Amino acid sequence: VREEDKLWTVKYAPTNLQQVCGNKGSVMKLKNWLANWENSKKNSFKHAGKDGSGVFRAAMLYGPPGIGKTTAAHLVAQELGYDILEQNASDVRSKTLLNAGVKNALDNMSVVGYFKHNEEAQNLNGKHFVIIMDEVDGMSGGGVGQLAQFCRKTSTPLILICNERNLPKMRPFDRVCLDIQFRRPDANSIKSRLMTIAIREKFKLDPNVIDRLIQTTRGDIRQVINLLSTISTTTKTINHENINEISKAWEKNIALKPFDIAHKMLDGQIYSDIGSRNFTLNDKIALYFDDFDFTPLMIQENYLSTRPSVLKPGQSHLEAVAEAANCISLGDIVEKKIRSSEQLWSLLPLHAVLSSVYPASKVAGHMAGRINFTAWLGQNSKSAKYYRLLQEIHYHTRLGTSTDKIGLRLDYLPTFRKRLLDPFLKQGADAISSVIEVMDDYYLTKEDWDSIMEFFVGPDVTTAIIKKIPATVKSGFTRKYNSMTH
Amino acid sequence: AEQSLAQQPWVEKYRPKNLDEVTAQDHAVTVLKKTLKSANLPHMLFYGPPGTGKTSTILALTKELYGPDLMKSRILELNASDERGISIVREKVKNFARLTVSKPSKHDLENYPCPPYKIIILDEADSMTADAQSALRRTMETYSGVTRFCLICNYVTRII
Amino acid sequence: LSLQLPWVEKYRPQVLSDIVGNKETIDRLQQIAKDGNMPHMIISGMPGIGKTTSVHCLAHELLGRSYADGVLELNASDDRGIDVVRNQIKHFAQKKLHLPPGKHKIVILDEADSMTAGAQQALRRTMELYSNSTRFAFACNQSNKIIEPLQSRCAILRYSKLSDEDVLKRLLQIIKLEDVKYTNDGLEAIIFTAEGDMRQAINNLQSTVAGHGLVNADNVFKIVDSPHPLIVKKMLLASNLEDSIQILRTDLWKKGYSSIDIVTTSFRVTKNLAQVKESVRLEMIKEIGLTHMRILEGVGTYLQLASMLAKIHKLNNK
Amino acid sequence: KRSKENLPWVEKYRPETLDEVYGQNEVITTVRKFVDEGKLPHLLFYGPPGTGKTSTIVALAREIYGKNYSNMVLELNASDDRGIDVVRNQIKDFASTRQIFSKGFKLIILDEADAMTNAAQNALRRVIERYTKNTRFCVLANYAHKLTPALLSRCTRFRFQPLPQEAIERRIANVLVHEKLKLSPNAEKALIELSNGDMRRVLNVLQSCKATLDNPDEDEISDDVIYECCGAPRPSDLKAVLKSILEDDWGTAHYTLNKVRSAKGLALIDLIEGIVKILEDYELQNEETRVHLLTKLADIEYSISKGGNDQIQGSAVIGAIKASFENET
Amino acid sequence: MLEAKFEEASLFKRIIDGFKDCVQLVNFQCKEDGIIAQAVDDSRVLLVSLEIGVEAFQEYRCDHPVTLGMDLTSLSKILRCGNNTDTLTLIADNTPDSIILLFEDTKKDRIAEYSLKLMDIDADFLKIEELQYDSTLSLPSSEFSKIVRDLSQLSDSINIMITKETIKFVADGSVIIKPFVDMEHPETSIKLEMDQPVDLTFGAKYLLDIIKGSSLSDRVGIRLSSEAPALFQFDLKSGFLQFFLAPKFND
Amino acid sequence: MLEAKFEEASLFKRIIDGFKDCVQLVNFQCKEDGIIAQAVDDSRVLLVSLEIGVEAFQEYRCDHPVTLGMDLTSLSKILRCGNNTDTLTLIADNTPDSIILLFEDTKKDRIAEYSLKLMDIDADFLKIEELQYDSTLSLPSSEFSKIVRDLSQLSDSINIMITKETIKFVADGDIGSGSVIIKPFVDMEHPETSIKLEMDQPVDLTFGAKYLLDIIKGSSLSDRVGIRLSSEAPALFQFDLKSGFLQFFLAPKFNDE
Ligand SMILES: Nc1ncnc2c1ncn2[C@@H]1O[C@H](COP(=O)(O)OP(=O)(O)OP(O)(O)=S)[C@@H](O)[C@H]1O
Ligand SMILES: Nc1ncnc2c1ncn2[C@@H]1O[C@H](COP(=O)(O)OP(=O)(O)OP(O)(O)=S)[C@@H](O)[C@H]1O
Ligand SMILES: Nc1ncnc2c1ncn2[C@@H]1O[C@H](COP(=O)(O)OP(=O)(O)OP(O)(O)=S)[C@@H](O)[C@H]1O
Ligand SMILES: Nc1ncnc2c1ncn2[C@@H]1O[C@H](COP(=O)(O)OP(=O)(O)OP(O)(O)=S)[C@@H](O)[C@H]1O
Ligand SMILES: [Mg+2]
Ligand SMILES: [Mg+2]
Ligand SMILES: [Mg+2]
Ligand SMILES: [Mg+2]
């Protein structure tokens, strides 16, 4: 055992909930939830509380790193006399091993708690489990699906801790469990802690530089503690005389997300005469290099949804948008050449400049609305889902149509609509005899009739006309089709 | 045989069989014919416009060098249908290049001049990737005594 | 047949005082070594500044004779997947070892930028839990490639390029220890072609010393081949097209430089050309990328580079 | 059957020792002094294709150990797999043990390491320096951008300059000594200018013009034979075509171009290069002329690289030249 | 510096074979009277403790009590190298950073030492002070392993009933046992002392891993209490090995 | 010409199985004395050397010394497609060409004639085994295999130390260590279990675990493995056959300390 060898972050860790600086409301809500979990379990979790918290069995912790998520989750379980079961990224987590190891500890009792203390009546929940799943983001080895399935068939407090909530892999956690958001604390919460540390270590700290220390490391208090500890070995006076070097040498190089990268590259402040030397082009290309999978899509999605501020004299908004789109097309050509054969990966920075930097710089200004999510990822999936159905229909009709999968969609389907659907509108339920004698000719079925109607666009929209015909003819057509043999 | 050559289009019906029926490129057939008496056949790279005689003169050179008996056992041909990738050019082409030349029969040895090397022809090399051609370098360089390479292309720039 | 060690390895510093790099960070590491409470640290910087040797001398001074069993170094040659980081690193973390009071076990993970994200994710808690016995120390070249939590837990220690004064001091030390005849011009030329790289500087020193004996400007500029990016930067800033074309012909093309390398170097130089404006830089980069695409299809003659230079001059002149 | 005379001239005249490597004197001297003094650091040869890198390193490996070089020396060319799983097992085991035959430092020759993945080079970055007092690495490359900066810094950079005229002339004389043959001086100058530094093209076209003699023992190889063997355009009709394009009208210029390119079966891709090389010497009294003259010609060359047409591109070259030679007036 | 010497390594081999699957780390206490060691499951539901006296050791020497925190997978890998005919010795020096397992051959001059590096485990040594159990039964271990193998193939939860001197093992499959004391065969003498009707519920894998130890003892003593974890005791030639299994939620 | 008729069929299969997955390309030299072969590993660390005289062959006829290079993968493919009850004959023509492996049953006429195209391996015939070794020893194959595959689970390096009437195998890894110390002793009732040792100087040197695990695969041929160790010399692991012998030349791993 030793007291000095500690890492300055475990000797000063909060040992009680009244020491967690910042986000009082979130930790208070979580404490009330963990306290009323038993009362909500008595009502089978089917009665929402004052804040609507008793209807959720599992808790979710998300926020920027280094704020006290794990610390709060440990202290709230230690204060109520519970027992702490903690699984983390180092342990192997998969649907098999998760259903093997912790599934049995989901509805069982504690074996070590029974020997802890039972002579005095402290609390009735000193024999139960609180399973803390930490760092849910890292599931490189049933990472999110099985854990989300644990949120419904649970019988013990289930606290989950992650870093970023809106990531697509952890979407199932959306409405199956309660979630709370921990924010970056201000400079007023950690100031008392930092001054008390400075008092207990015989080294000066001006109360005026702590705000800059919190600003250079956005929301990681542990980073501030490590910064102070590393510098307090040779310099014991940290004031406004050397704060610039500290703030410049200890910056945080966080990775930017599709929303933030677009918001940054679309800001008209960098491409000005002053900002061009404070945020150089090398940094702009590194911004793309942080995520080369979504940045071009984001830029193509929201390059014309902003109000520029770098418009050259004479050049309007439409011309700038046109040049941005031309460079977008060129970057698309470069990207296709990159991801084609020969695996030309040395052409990446040219794509970074053509697809992202140039169209952004051309329409750089102040964004009017919000950063919209890219739409091409969903449109391509829809196009593929429709192409599958078109190929199926074409290979069903190949015996008689004698036309490619392209010439059928552009030409045949307009007349097939008149032949198939129109008799059901103008003639009613007595045209059921005619329509069938059509589809048996082209080997169609009910599934093909369901798909053919969905292709038409423009004035002819069938997804609304289908709801207009009576339901009795709908129920009779399927029966007539299933009854007769081909 | 003769009925077979009669029952095919004029393109294949009059394909030159020796080095004398190819009356288009007198600068290259001269070297290819002088090579017959000698034995120093260098690695060849035929390049030019489509439909000129490359694939039709390399086969004639092979037939005149080895003969109809040794041809099917002394050459390898990778034109377009085979899977010409980095793994294949690393394994199979290298195995065939680093391989002992077959024993010429007395008939073939007496009639045709059999040189002490095989022939690997990679037809239309402009379709190979860059890594495959890069791997071809030392493979064609070190086994130069028992194997000579003949590339054919319509665009010399595509070759590394 | 005995082969003498190279000047880069024979004179590799084995004492933290012999490091001539950044004075502040080296003094911090020295005080940490004399005290012993070494916290987790990431060391990153330009290639060839003394990060690995610094952390290795730190470990040797902190553990002394226990270096054989107290340090577990994992390089890129050794496996660094999830399996090893979960089994061997953990088993070494809990390894009970009786060290002096103010000492700790150290884990030297060199080239941290090559590890998978899952490895760092699994390493987070393995490092955080056993802080009383294990103090990790990462040494990479790109701090951006490391995940955020692992980087935030440790205390970051940036490294800047070696100034010419430090390089000349170490060069003078090497010459004094090796008894070599030299002139000031040769040392200045070596520093200028070293582009702030200690290993490259020492290698070029040994090369010219063994090749000609006398370290003079002629010998180094003869067999060191003064750096590439500077010539390309000089080429792209010529006044008239003829001067830039003559530079490309005599200095780059005639000296045997592949067209793809010239194009890539010109792109990288224009990327960091702070003199000219932003729009002209973007247009020059676009034209250089068009020329690069033309080069990659196979056609890489001198005419393509000449037309690229002509387009850059037409763009910059109007 | 198999003998030294059956090999092509590209390999038959391979330099056995370092003394038969002309041109790169300033590197061969340093390498010989390295091996003589006893110290040999990690080398990195970087040069254009066909300069002498592989031959130099093979001669060095022969000089160091003996006449049996491929016994205790490892060689990883582009023909073997060089993934990360290879640099982990094979190279490390070879660099971590001793030799089997003698007692010396081991040699590892990574030929054409530009074709290695970034992970493989990053893994090699530490094993190349962990075992230094026992093994030495030699990295041969043609493109100095494929290598990571770290691996590029650890090795001593040796550039292989293209062969100057004197070196190729000495090699031509040495080849003409061993092979009964005679070669004309103007033919020698044409061959030097066509070489473009490539020592392999020299020997190739030399074997070609020797084969095209019908008696390679008495008649001398004139310039016409060399120009015919490779089909390259003679400077005479090249300058004639350039003059007719610059001076004459459209009809007669197109006629003389179609007559010159059909008299010997020339190619437009070579005519463009020849005209560019001849016309780079002119003193244009403006900057806007050369800009268009280079841009349009490069576009036409890139289009020829795809083989669209054959006469439209020729008339395009004519039009580009004529329109570029108009801002002068 | 502790030195222990067994007469035959197969005893310790079977001992570590009994519970190498329910836990991964174990703290072996070393006193003057003997060796006691308890390890908690990684899910903290099942606890395995064991005590071996000096009667099992051919030789024993312990000057001061020492705590040895070691992994089981690595220790099993090391013990796999030894043969059943070698005498086994445990050697430990002051401040035991490593432990020496030495196999010595009697009729052969082949001595083999293996050093194992210990782990630094949080030795929260919890007391095992006696709590009065309602039901205490003794039943052959083989029959118990068989019946739990039968019930486990049906579901995961297993209910145990001790009512009116009758035993009910229900799988939700049911097996009913009555206590028979036979003088002829004492090994099958299923004994039962009951104070209250006992009702517990357990899981599958915990029982499957406890019955893996049904090779050191022919009879197991199972002790139940309605508000206390179940105890599974197996006797040894010198000591005893007991499992503590936590109950299930009542529904 | 070259005609080599074996007495059985599985003999050559078991012989090749010793270095099946250890070397890839071999080159058999056939002379009037017998078949010799030597092949270097892919990483140029160990060398397999096999010598089989005219004792194992039922019939042998070779006029002039012939060299036949071939890969081991295709050779094993050819040996696998032959039934273990036939008679095997290696046949080579005047000039070295595709070798003919012929399987002929002894009861029913089954002629299985397979061809194997030769590789052109450079004939760098090596001459080792004339170097005076410092220490020689011999011990049963089962004990060596057990010791090596028990020590391989703890590390990747194995230090062999021959000291005064003591042999010591030491494995030092990450999870632990292990030391097996044996002493020379000879029994009269079982002459095959005896461990023999003749030393001149104590020798301590390291090897890799993968190469040892690949070498001990040859323990299926004989039962008494011989080990010859010497400083600045490749370690010799010899298996004695009924007609010749199979010897592995392993390169020791140097120590940085
Ligand atoms: N509000 C706070 N008040 C005081 N100390 C804090 C606070 N937040 C964090 N800490 C310190 O930060 C350390 C605990 O780290 P945590 O913030 O709990 O890590 P985390 O929240 O789980 O974020 P991750 O897991 O690294 S993404 C201890 O040293 C605490 O003293
Ligand atoms: N030089 C030639 N002499 C005689 N006939 C020729 C010649 N070139 C082409 N032909 C005729 O045209 C046919 C096609 O010639 P090929 O050599 O197969 O074409 P090619 O040179 O392979 O062009 P590719 O395959 O598109 S690169 C031959 O079978 C002959 O009938
Ligand atoms: N500050 C320094 N003072 C003296 N020698 C130095 C210094 N920095 C580097 N060196 C020399 O460089 C070599 C060791 O450098 P390294 O530590 O390998 O560089 P690095 O920081 O690890 O960067 P990498 O790993 O190559 S990308 C030895 O030859 C040292 O002598
Ligand atoms: N300096 C030289 N002196 C004489 N002959 C040379 C020289 N360089 C090249 N050659 C000739 O060219 C042949 C091949 O040269 P290599 O050194 O193998 O080419 P290289 O340096 O490997 O370049 P690569 O590998 O094609 S990029 C030799 O066998 C010689 O015939
Ligand atoms: Mg956490
Ligand atoms: Mg063709
Ligand atoms: Mg380093
Ligand atoms: Mg080469």
Coordinates of N, CA and C in Angstrom, one line a residue, chain D residues 220-310:
Chain D
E220 N 28.6 -2.7 -91.3 CA 28.4 -1.8 -90.1 C 27.0 -1.4 -89.9
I221 N 26.6 -1.2 -88.6 CA 25.2 -0.8 -88.3 C 25.1 0.7 -88.5
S222 N 24.5 1.1 -89.6 CA 24.3 2.5 -89.9 C 23.1 3.0 -89.1
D223 N 22.9 4.3 -89.2 CA 21.8 4.9 -88.4 C 20.4 4.5 -89.0
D224 N 20.3 4.2 -90.3 CA 19.0 3.8 -90.8 C 18.6 2.4 -90.2
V225 N 19.5 1.5 -90.0 CA 19.2 0.2 -89.4 C 18.6 0.4 -88.0
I226 N 19.3 1.2 -87.2 CA 18.8 1.5 -85.8 C 17.4 2.2 -85.9
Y227 N 17.2 3.1 -86.8 CA 16.0 3.8 -86.8 C 14.8 2.9 -87.3
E228 N 15.2 1.9 -88.1 CA 14.2 1.0 -88.6 C 13.9 -0.1 -87.6
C229 N 14.8 -0.5 -86.8 CA 14.6 -1.6 -85.9 C 13.5 -1.2 -84.8
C230 N 13.6 0.0 -84.3 CA 12.6 0.5 -83.4 C 11.5 1.3 -84.0
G231 N 11.6 1.6 -85.3 CA 10.6 2.4 -86.0 C 10.5 3.8 -85.6
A232 N 11.6 4.3 -84.9 CA 11.6 5.7 -84.5 C 11.8 6.6 -85.7
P233 N 11.2 7.8 -85.7 CA 11.3 8.7 -86.8 C 12.7 9.3 -86.9
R234 N 13.3 9.3 -88.1 CA 14.6 10.0 -88.3 C 14.5 11.5 -88.1
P235 N 15.5 12.2 -87.6 CA 15.4 13.6 -87.4 C 15.1 14.4 -88.7
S236 N 15.6 13.8 -89.8 CA 15.4 14.4 -91.1 C 13.9 14.7 -91.5
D237 N 13.2 13.6 -91.6 CA 11.8 13.8 -92.0 C 10.9 14.4 -90.8
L238 N 11.4 14.2 -89.6 CA 10.8 14.9 -88.5 C 10.9 16.4 -88.6
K239 N 12.1 16.9 -88.9 CA 12.2 18.4 -89.1 C 11.5 18.8 -90.3
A240 N 11.5 18.0 -91.4 CA 10.8 18.3 -92.6 C 9.3 18.5 -92.3
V241 N 8.7 17.5 -91.5 CA 7.3 17.6 -91.2 C 7.0 18.9 -90.3
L242 N 7.9 19.2 -89.4 CA 7.7 20.3 -88.6 C 7.8 21.6 -89.4
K243 N 8.7 21.7 -90.3 CA 8.8 22.9 -91.2 C 7.6 23.0 -92.1
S244 N 7.1 21.9 -92.6 CA 5.9 21.9 -93.5 C 4.7 22.3 -92.7
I245 N 4.6 21.9 -91.5 CA 3.5 22.3 -90.7 C 3.6 23.8 -90.3
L246 N 4.8 24.3 -90.0 CA 4.9 25.7 -89.5 C 4.7 26.7 -90.7
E247 N 5.2 26.3 -91.9 CA 5.3 27.2 -93.0 C 4.1 27.1 -94.0
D248 N 3.9 25.8 -94.5 CA 3.0 25.6 -95.6 C 1.6 25.7 -95.2
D249 N 0.6 25.5 -96.1 CA -0.8 25.6 -95.8 C -1.3 24.3 -95.3
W250 N -2.6 24.2 -95.2 CA -3.3 23.1 -94.5 C -3.2 21.8 -95.4
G251 N -3.6 21.9 -96.7 CA -3.7 20.8 -97.5 C -2.4 20.1 -97.7
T252 N -1.4 20.8 -98.1 CA -0.1 20.2 -98.3 C 0.6 19.7 -97.1
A253 N 0.3 20.4 -95.9 CA 0.9 19.9 -94.7 C 0.2 18.6 -94.3
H254 N -1.1 18.5 -94.4 CA -1.7 17.2 -94.1 C -1.2 16.1 -95.1
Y255 N -1.0 16.5 -96.4 CA -0.5 15.5 -97.4 C 0.9 15.0 -97.0
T256 N 1.8 15.9 -96.6 CA 3.1 15.5 -96.3 C 3.2 14.8 -95.0
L257 N 2.3 15.1 -94.1 CA 2.2 14.3 -92.8 C 1.8 12.9 -93.1
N258 N 0.7 12.7 -93.9 CA 0.2 11.4 -94.3 C 1.2 10.6 -95.1
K259 N 2.1 11.4 -95.9 CA 3.1 10.7 -96.7 C 4.3 10.3 -95.9
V260 N 4.7 11.0 -94.9 CA 5.8 10.7 -94.0 C 5.4 9.5 -93.1
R261 N 4.3 9.6 -92.5 CA 3.8 8.6 -91.5 C 3.4 7.3 -92.2
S262 N 3.4 7.3 -93.5 CA 3.0 6.0 -94.2 C 4.2 5.5 -95.1
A263 N 5.3 6.2 -95.1 CA 6.5 5.7 -95.8 C 7.3 4.7 -95.1
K264 N 7.3 4.8 -93.7 CA 8.0 3.7 -92.9 C 7.0 3.2 -91.9
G265 N 5.8 3.6 -91.8 CA 4.8 3.1 -90.8 C 5.1 3.7 -89.5
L266 N 5.3 5.0 -89.4 CA 5.6 5.6 -88.1 C 4.3 5.7 -87.3
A267 N 4.5 6.1 -86.0 CA 3.3 6.3 -85.1 C 3.3 7.7 -84.6
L268 N 2.0 8.2 -84.4 CA 1.8 9.6 -84.0 C 2.4 9.9 -82.6
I269 N 2.4 8.9 -81.8 CA 2.9 9.1 -80.4 C 4.4 9.4 -80.4
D270 N 5.1 8.8 -81.3 CA 6.5 9.1 -81.4 C 6.8 10.5 -82.1
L271 N 5.9 10.8 -83.1 CA 6.1 12.0 -83.8 C 5.8 13.2 -82.9
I272 N 4.8 13.1 -82.0 CA 4.6 14.1 -81.0 C 5.8 14.4 -80.1
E273 N 6.4 13.3 -79.6 CA 7.5 13.4 -78.7 C 8.7 14.0 -79.5
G274 N 8.9 13.6 -80.7 CA 10.0 14.2 -81.5 C 9.8 15.6 -81.8
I275 N 8.6 16.0 -82.2 CA 8.4 17.4 -82.5 C 8.5 18.3 -81.2
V276 N 8.1 17.7 -80.1 CA 8.2 18.5 -78.8 C 9.7 18.7 -78.5
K277 N 10.5 17.6 -78.6 CA 11.9 17.7 -78.3 C 12.6 18.7 -79.2
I278 N 12.2 18.7 -80.5 CA 12.9 19.6 -81.5 C 12.4 21.0 -81.2
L279 N 11.2 21.2 -80.8 CA 10.6 22.6 -80.7 C 10.8 23.2 -79.4
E280 N 11.2 22.4 -78.4 CA 11.6 23.0 -77.1 C 12.8 23.9 -77.1
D281 N 13.5 23.8 -78.2 CA 14.7 24.6 -78.4 C 14.4 26.0 -79.0
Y282 N 13.3 26.2 -79.6 CA 12.9 27.5 -80.2 C 12.8 28.6 -79.1
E283 N 13.1 29.8 -79.6 CA 13.0 31.0 -78.7 C 11.7 31.8 -79.0
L284 N 10.6 31.4 -78.3 CA 9.3 32.0 -78.5 C 9.4 33.3 -77.7
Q285 N 9.0 34.4 -78.4 CA 9.0 35.7 -77.8 C 7.7 36.1 -77.2
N286 N 7.1 35.2 -76.4 CA 5.9 35.3 -75.6 C 5.7 34.1 -74.7
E287 N 4.9 34.2 -73.7 CA 4.6 33.1 -72.8 C 3.3 32.4 -73.1
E288 N 2.4 33.1 -73.8 CA 1.1 32.5 -74.1 C 1.2 31.4 -75.2
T289 N 2.3 31.5 -76.0 CA 2.5 30.5 -77.1 C 2.8 29.1 -76.5
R290 N 3.8 29.1 -75.6 CA 4.3 27.8 -75.1 C 3.2 27.1 -74.2
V291 N 2.4 28.0 -73.5 CA 1.3 27.4 -72.7 C 0.3 26.6 -73.5
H292 N -0.2 27.1 -74.6 CA -1.1 26.4 -75.4 C -0.4 25.2 -76.1
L293 N 0.9 25.5 -76.6 CA 1.6 24.5 -77.3 C 1.8 23.3 -76.5
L294 N 2.0 23.4 -75.1 CA 2.1 22.3 -74.3 C 0.8 21.7 -73.9
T295 N -0.2 22.5 -73.6 CA -1.5 22.0 -73.1 C -2.2 21.2 -74.2
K296 N -2.3 21.7 -75.4 CA -3.0 21.0 -76.4 C -2.3 19.7 -76.8
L297 N -0.9 19.8 -76.9 CA -0.2 18.6 -77.2 C -0.3 17.5 -76.1
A298 N -0.3 17.9 -74.9 CA -0.5 16.9 -73.8 C -1.8 16.3 -73.8
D299 N -2.9 17.1 -74.1 CA -4.2 16.6 -74.3 C -4.3 15.6 -75.4
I300 N -3.7 15.9 -76.5 CA -3.7 15.0 -77.7 C -2.9 13.7 -77.4
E301 N -1.8 13.8 -76.6 CA -1.1 12.6 -76.2 C -1.9 11.7 -75.3
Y302 N -2.6 12.3 -74.3 CA -3.4 11.5 -73.4 C -4.6 10.9 -74.2
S303 N -5.1 11.5 -75.2 CA -6.2 10.9 -76.0 C -5.6 9.8 -76.9
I304 N -4.4 10.0 -77.4 CA -3.8 8.9 -78.1 C -3.5 7.7 -77.2
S305 N -3.2 7.9 -75.9 CA -3.0 6.9 -75.0 C -4.2 5.9 -74.8
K306 N -5.4 6.4 -75.3 CA -6.6 5.6 -75.3 C -6.9 5.0 -76.7
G307 N -6.3 5.5 -77.7 CA -6.5 5.0 -79.1 C -7.9 5.2 -79.6
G308 N -8.3 6.5 -79.7 CA -9.5 6.9 -80.3 C -9.5 6.8 -81.8
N309 N -8.8 7.6 -82.5 CA -8.7 7.6 -83.9 C -7.2 7.7 -84.3
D310 N -6.9 7.8 -85.6 CA -5.6 7.9 -86.1 C -5.3 9.1 -87.0

